[PDB]
A paper describes a structure:
The chromophores of reversibly switchable fluorescent proteins (rsFPs) undergo photoisomerization of both the trans and cis forms. Concurrent with cis/trans photoisomerisation, rsFPs typically become protonated on the phenolic oxygen resulting in a blue shift of the absorption. A synthetic rsFP referred to as rsEospa, derived from EosFP family, displays the same spectroscopic behavior as the GFP-like rsFP Dronpa at pH 8.4 and involves the photoconversion between nonfluorescent neutral and fluorescent anionic chromophore states. RsEospa shows cis–trans isomerization at both acidic and neutral pH with similar atomic coordinate modification but distinctively different visible excitation requirements and spectral features.
Numbering used by the authors: 2 to 61, 65 to 221
The structure:
Amino acid sequence: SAIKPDMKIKLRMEGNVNGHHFVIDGDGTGKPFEGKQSMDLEVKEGGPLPFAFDILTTAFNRVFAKYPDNIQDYFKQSFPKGYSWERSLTFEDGGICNARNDITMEGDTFYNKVRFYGTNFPANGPVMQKKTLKWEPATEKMYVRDGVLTGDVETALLLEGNAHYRCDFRTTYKAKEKGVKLPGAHFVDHCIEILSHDKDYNKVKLYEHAVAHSGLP
């Protein structure tokens, strides 16, 4: 396999949320076969961010997902040429985000060209007031729609004061090489956590664990 057990991650995100521009660099490592990755993020422009860092974290690669033998692993089969994804995030208070990542590989390193655009967050809402605590663990439903691998998530951020803030995600995934075979319908469970950060989330250590499964025992 082109994909080694230990891989490096280099990332640049450029984005705009409610008109605030930012550039964030990431450096990390992961274990594709164990579905684990960790990365150090550093805000390079636009800091301190005037919105909840949590809305960005799912944009900071389903190659870091433990896939069993009985499910086609589209993501690992996409290398070395790579793949990209496009995602819409719809929040319950009208906030909308569009994100994309183009993922390439050179030697032992995944390179990520990430774009993140968010609009329509109410100024008095939990995102612009920085009242988010974390993403709850979530399940991504994977299926092919009209020849395109699609992942749906229905989830929520936990807020201060025992409240939840609902978000629906739809991601479409496309391999760069024609003829990478599409998988059957399946689930990917993930957990995403900010392990540590400094005062205004200028530096953030991010961790994610993901496991693909078929639903039953």
